[PDB]
Amino acid sequence: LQGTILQYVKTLMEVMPKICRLPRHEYGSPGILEFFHHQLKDIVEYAELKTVCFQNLREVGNAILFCLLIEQSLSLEEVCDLLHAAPFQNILPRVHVKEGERLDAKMKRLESKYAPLHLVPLIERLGTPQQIAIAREGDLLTKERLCCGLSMFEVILTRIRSFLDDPIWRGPLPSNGVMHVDECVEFHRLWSAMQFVYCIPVGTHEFTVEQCFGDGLHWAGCMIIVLLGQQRRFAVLDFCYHLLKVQKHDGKDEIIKNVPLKKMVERIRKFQILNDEIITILDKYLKVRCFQPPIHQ
Amino acid sequence: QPSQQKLAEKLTILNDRGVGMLTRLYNIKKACGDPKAKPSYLIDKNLESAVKFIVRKFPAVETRNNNQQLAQLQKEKSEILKNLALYYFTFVDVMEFKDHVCELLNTIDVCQVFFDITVNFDLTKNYLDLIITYTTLMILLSRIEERKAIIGLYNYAHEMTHGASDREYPRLGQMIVDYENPLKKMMEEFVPHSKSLSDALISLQMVYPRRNLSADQWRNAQLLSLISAPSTMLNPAQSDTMPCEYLSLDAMEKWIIFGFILCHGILNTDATALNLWKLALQSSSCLSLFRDEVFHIHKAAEDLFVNIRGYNKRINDIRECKEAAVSHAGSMHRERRKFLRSALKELATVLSDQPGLLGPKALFVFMALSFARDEIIWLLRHADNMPKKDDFIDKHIAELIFYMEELRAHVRKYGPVMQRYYVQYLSGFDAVVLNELVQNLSVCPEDESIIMSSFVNTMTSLSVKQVEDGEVFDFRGMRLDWFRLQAYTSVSKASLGLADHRELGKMMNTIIFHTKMVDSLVEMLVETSDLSIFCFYSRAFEKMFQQCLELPSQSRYSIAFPLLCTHFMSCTHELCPEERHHIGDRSLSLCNMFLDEMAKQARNLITD
Amino acid sequence: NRLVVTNLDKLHTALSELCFSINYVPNMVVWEHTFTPREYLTSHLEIRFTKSIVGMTMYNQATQEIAKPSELLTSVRAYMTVLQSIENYVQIDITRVFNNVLL
Amino acid sequence: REIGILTTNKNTSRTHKIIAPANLERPVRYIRKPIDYTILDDIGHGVKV
Amino acid sequence: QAIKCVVVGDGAVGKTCLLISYTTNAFSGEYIPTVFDNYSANVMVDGKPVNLGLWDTAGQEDYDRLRPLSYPQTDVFLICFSLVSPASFENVRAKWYPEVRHHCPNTPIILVGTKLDLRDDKDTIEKLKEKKLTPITYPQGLAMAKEIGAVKYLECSALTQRGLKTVFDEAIRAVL
Ligand SMILES: Nc1nc2c(ncn2[C@@H]2O[C@H](COP(=O)(O)OP(=O)(O)NP(=O)(O)O)[C@@H](O)[C@H]2O)c(=O)[nH]1
Numbered sequence A: 001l002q003g004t005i006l007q008y009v010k011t012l013m014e015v016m017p018k019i020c021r022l023p024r025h026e027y028g029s030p031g032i033l034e035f036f037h038h039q040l041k042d043i044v045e046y047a048e049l050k051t052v053c054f055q056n057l058r059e060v061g062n063a064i065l066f067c068l069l070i071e072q073s074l075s076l077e078e079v080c081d082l083l084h085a086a087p088f089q090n091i092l093p094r095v096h097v098k099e100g101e102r103l104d105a106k107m108k109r110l111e112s113k114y115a116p117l118h119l120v121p122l123i124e125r126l127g128t129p130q131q132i133a134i135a136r137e138g139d140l141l142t143k144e145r146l147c148c149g150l151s152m153f154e155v156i157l158t159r160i161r162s163f164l165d166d167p168i169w170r171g172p173l174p175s176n177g178v179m180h181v182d183e184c185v186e187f188h189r190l191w192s193a194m195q196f197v198y199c200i201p202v203g204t205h206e207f208t209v210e211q212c213f214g215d216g217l218h219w220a221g222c223m224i225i226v227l228l229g230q231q232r233r234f235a236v237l238d239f240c241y242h243l244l245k246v247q248k249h250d251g252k253d254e255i256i257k258n259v260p261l262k263k264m265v266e267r268i269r270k271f272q273i274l275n276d277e278i279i280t281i282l283d284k285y286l287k288v289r290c291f292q293p294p295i296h297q
Numbered sequence B: 001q002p003s004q005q006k007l008a009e010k011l012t013i014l015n016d017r018g019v020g021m022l023t024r025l026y027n028i029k030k031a032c033g034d035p036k037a038k039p040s041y042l043i044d045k046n047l048e049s050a051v052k053f054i055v056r057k058f059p060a061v062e063t064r065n066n067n068q069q070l071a072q073l074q075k076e077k078s079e080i081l082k083n084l085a086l087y088y089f090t091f092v093d094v095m096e097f098k099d100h101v102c103e104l105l106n107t108i109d110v111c112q113v114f115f116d117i118t119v120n121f122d123l124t125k126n127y128l129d130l131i132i133t134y135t136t137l138m139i140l141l142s143r144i145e146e147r148k149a150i151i152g153l154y155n156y157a158h159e160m161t162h163g164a165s166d167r168e169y170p171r172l173g174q175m176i177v178d179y180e181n182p183l184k185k186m187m188e189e190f191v192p193h194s195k196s197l198s199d200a201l202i203s204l205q206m207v208y209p210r211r212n213l214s215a216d217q218w219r220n221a222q223l224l225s226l227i228s229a230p231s232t233m234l235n236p237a238q239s240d241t242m243p244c245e246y247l248s249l250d251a252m253e254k255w256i257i258f259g260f261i262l263c264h265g266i267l268n269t270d271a272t273a274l275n276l277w278k279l280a281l282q283s284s285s286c287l288s289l290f291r292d293e294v295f296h297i298h299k300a301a302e303d304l305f306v307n308i309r310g311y312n313k314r315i316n317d318i319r320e321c322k323e324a325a326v327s328h329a330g331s332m333h334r335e336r337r338k339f340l341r342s343a344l345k346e347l348a349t350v351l352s353d354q355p356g357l358l359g360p361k362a363l364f365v366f367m368a369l370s371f372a373r374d375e376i377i378w379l380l381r382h383a384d385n386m387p388k389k390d391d392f393i394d395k396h397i398a399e400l401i402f403y404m405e406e407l408r409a410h411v412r413k414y415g416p417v418m419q420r421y422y423v424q425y426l427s428g429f430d431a432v433v434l435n436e437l438v439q440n441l442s443v444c445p446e447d448e449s450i451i452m453s454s455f456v457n458t459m460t461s462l463s464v465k466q467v468e469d470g471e472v473f474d475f476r477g478m479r480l481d482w483f484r485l486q487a488y489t490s491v492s493k494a495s496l497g498l499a500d501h502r503e504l505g506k507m508m509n510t511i512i513f514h515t516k517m518v519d520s521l522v523e524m525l526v527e528t529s530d531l532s533i534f535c536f537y538s539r540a541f542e543k544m545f546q547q548c549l550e551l552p553s554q555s556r557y558s559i560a561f562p563l564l565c566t567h568f569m570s571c572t573h574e575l576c577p578e579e580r581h582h583i584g585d586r587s588l589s590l591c592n593m594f595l596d597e598m599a600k601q602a603r604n605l606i607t608d
Numbered sequence C: 001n002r003l004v005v006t007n008l009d010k011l012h013t014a015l016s017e018l019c020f021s022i023n024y025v026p027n028m029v030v031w032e033h034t035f036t037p038r039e040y041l042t043s044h045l046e047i048r049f050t051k052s053i054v055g056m057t058m059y060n061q062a063t064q065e066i067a068k069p070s071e072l073l074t075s076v077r078a079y080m081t082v083l084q085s086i087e088n089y090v091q092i093d094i095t096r097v098f099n100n101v102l103l
Numbered sequence D: 001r002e003i004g005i006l007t008t009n010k011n012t013s014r015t016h017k018i019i020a021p022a023n024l025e026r027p028v029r030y031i032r033k034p035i036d037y038t039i040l041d042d043i044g045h046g047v048k049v
Numbered sequence E: 001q002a003i004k005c006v007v008v009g010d011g012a013v014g015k016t017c018l019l020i021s022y023t024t025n026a027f028s029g030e031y032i033p034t035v036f037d038n039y040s041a042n043v044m045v046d047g048k049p050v051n052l053g054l055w056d057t058a059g060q061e062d063y064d065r066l067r068p069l070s071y072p073q074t075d076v077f078l079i080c081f082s083l084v085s086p087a088s089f090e091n092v093r094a095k096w097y098p099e100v101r102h103h104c105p106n107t108p109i110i111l112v113g114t115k116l117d118l119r120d121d122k123d124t125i126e127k128l129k130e131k132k133l134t135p136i137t138y139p140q141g142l143a144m145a146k147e148i149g150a151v152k153y154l155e156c157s158a159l160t161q162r163g164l165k166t167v168f169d170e171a172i173r174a175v176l
């Protein structure tokens, strides 16, 4: 992130339009695609985007997935291990109770039945003090584990956020005093441009992003957006989403610069679903400003 | 005694009374509709002869000659009195309410009050609402098909046991036999009231036509878009007619249709009223008297106007309006819902990103909620009724409700920032502007002055330090005082005429809205996005939930339905306490069922 | 290509959408009654998991047939892995669910 | 201790499916009363007649 | 209350620069060609508050098909030509004016000269002379405007903002 990726985003931000305004619905879905191709024609012609920047994003995205999956497996193995230690820790299940008897009597009888299995008092009543200490320490280590209210994915996300400190990620303060709308000085703007370029249907002799990088690239981009607090802006401001909305409203198909319009929007919808799912997962794992009123002159 | 009329207090009290009476009549009609909850004295076959005898002559009472046709009722008079007291007294209260409104309307006519929605919004709104409440109450009464049996049977038992009929019975019987087609008699009764009512209706020409625009105009003017102009989003949205921005369009249609039906004389002369009348007819094909009760407009209007001498043109106009409504109303509302879905989604996301914008752009939130509520109500009442044929079924209402709930949650959570923004607004801007306005008046009395001076002083005292301390305000005094001031200045032979000071009325209305937002956030939310009607449309409520679950795309917004169940307690009135437990129990059941079904669907996907 | 949709992704998309709706509200109040939707899912998962485990043993008394333990263990592990994936969406704790059902 | 450096607590808790208040909402009996116009006088600059 | 204005003309004639000078009060020396854009300003003219929506077309030949989208449901038409470019002046006679006539025949037209600041520049008069071109003068526009039958003829300079406000105020007056 601090190296090759930072350089690529810096170079790419300089070839992005200074001001981009989402066209009005009057222009129509066919005309709005022509506006975006002209506005972002530098990014499309760029070649190393699909060779280096995509590769690096896949590396980080795959790493995060590995961290998530390994944590899940560790918990699954950990809970299975704890299940086998229940008899020796006086951990009993909820036994069936029917009319005629109360829970307290049945539980007390069941506990007495399994009393010999319990280890600590058996060593305490008879056994060397060294055995007592070792058994107590072993019992403490076994009972306390990392699936009993402990996680580490949050810490990983926080550390990644700390690694992002260059102002280029967030950009300068907005002139309106609230948020950037038309300016393209934020990373989510570039991710939208990236979404546009790799949502174009490729030819038969070339591979697609999924065939090459899979979901790792999307995971990396969504994580960067989330850690910078720009997920809502990305959803509101997105060239592909705007094109999809207009296409649905009007419903027109036409080949623009050898880029079919229909197949493009379904691809946009599919990636929109994937991005939403990833953002929701990241937000779940991640768990003001007051303006002044006008004053009379 | 113009100052002692107290129109403000009378209007606000009677409006609440009318709502309570409407609730009582609706419960009575519902109870007697099914043969399971109606009184046991009307279902027994042995007592059928007495009922027929009383029905044959309801107002006339004859007891000294049984004629062998009534001996059965003699032996159970005591239980009759004990069990039918509730219904008899409820009708009595309706008669008292009817008398009070008639007296108030006559007082308004003699005083020659000035009505204008833009100038005096509160007075005109209360006046029109009261009239519609009175008209709806009579129409609902004319539907309960047993009012005669109850009144006749109860009084007859009272006469037998005591020898004298009820003191207030004859008036009730005379009105019942007089109101068989209530609109027909109301038209004749409202002739003296035509001038005031017509002026108020015509005052809506500046609001109603611009609030009934199609989705194309909304898209052209970028309605409810904070992002469309980025350099002015920090600026506070405001307008001179602030209260009318978030008014219920359904209320306007009810006011227009009922008002011109009673004031049909002015339709031939004036053209603005006729065009406004035409637009209301085209906008809808059925109107909602109370909860599920519905009134068709073209058949009823045609029947009333056919007897008139030379109203053939009006009969024709109703025909074309009916044809246009049935042909285009559904498409127009479908497009409106489509645009609103995106608009609410954009507004909610932007507000979440920048919660501080709620204060300046609070009006946009309330306007969006009102529009969404109007569309939901319109779809819900038309879909069940009006079978013409599919076109009245929407599978994306879940998104609209969910974003309405999201806006409600944002207002609840981010209330303090709105309070701080508007308390500063009142203390800094409104107070100074109001003071220089009042001081630039030719002359004012003591009664009018003591109110204006009190408004300025209350606004100056307000400080931001009282907000973070948890202090709770109470601006009901200012609202009532302004309402009283409107009544005082709206009458004739008044020193300070409100007509010549229209800008003052607009300024006060904006200030009142600011106070309403500061202190009555909950009241504004409920009166803007009320959706308690779903409690009385359970079939559609369940069907929509089932469709939402079936479609994976909308499954994200299935939590809106249980959230809507929380609003079911907002339709209860202190006057009808019996209904509260039944509506409260229904809310708990639906919520549990929805959660269970959602869990069932989840585990089914888990298994697959 | 992404245009082709299988059964797994379709179910995955639907489940994620439903889970988001459930987790949108932590709690709600109706007539002074607090409702916790995630508890509904947790209870249903416990019942379904227990029912499925007893069902995949495939025990027919008439033919004296039972599933081999290795196959049952593999199926149980797959079920647990899926349930953990659900935990990535909703805030519910799953380790407890495993403890109760298995014990 | 090494895996613990990168570990944080979980904000997970258990609550019952349905929770009810200590005191329920008992029904209130209805009492018929006439219309009174002298109830809003005590709020604001009212007029007594 | 709301007036729709669309500005058309040859490329590099200062159309977007004029609208930007009117709305943000700033000047940009760069040349970024525009397929389409929308600019909105609120103004008080003749004692009636008017909200002005302004539409920017392209002066490039390739974007001809995507230009007619802006024309429908309009109130006023703006034609801008550079005072230091005779080519744009003649285009009004044979291209930009005939086009607004076809799509919207009964709509008024306001003709605006641009780059007045550069008009008096001998430095600019000289390089145009090496091309054997001479700058346009005031009376020439009067004849052309009368010929195209436009409501009025004016001149502007975004850099000096000498005639910027009059062009829009006069445009609101033509629609009324
Ligand atoms: N000196 C000077 N330069 C100007 C003036 N107005 C515009 N320019 C310059 O002339 C060039 C073209 O202006 P521009 O507004 O981009 O032209 P346009 O016709 O709006 N562009 P398009 O072809 O896309 O429609 C720019 O380099 C701009 O800076 C002016 O008043 N003075």
Ligand SMILES: [Mg+2]
Pocket (backbone or CB within 6 Å): E015, E016, E017, E032, E033, E034, E056
């Ligand atoms: Mg331009």
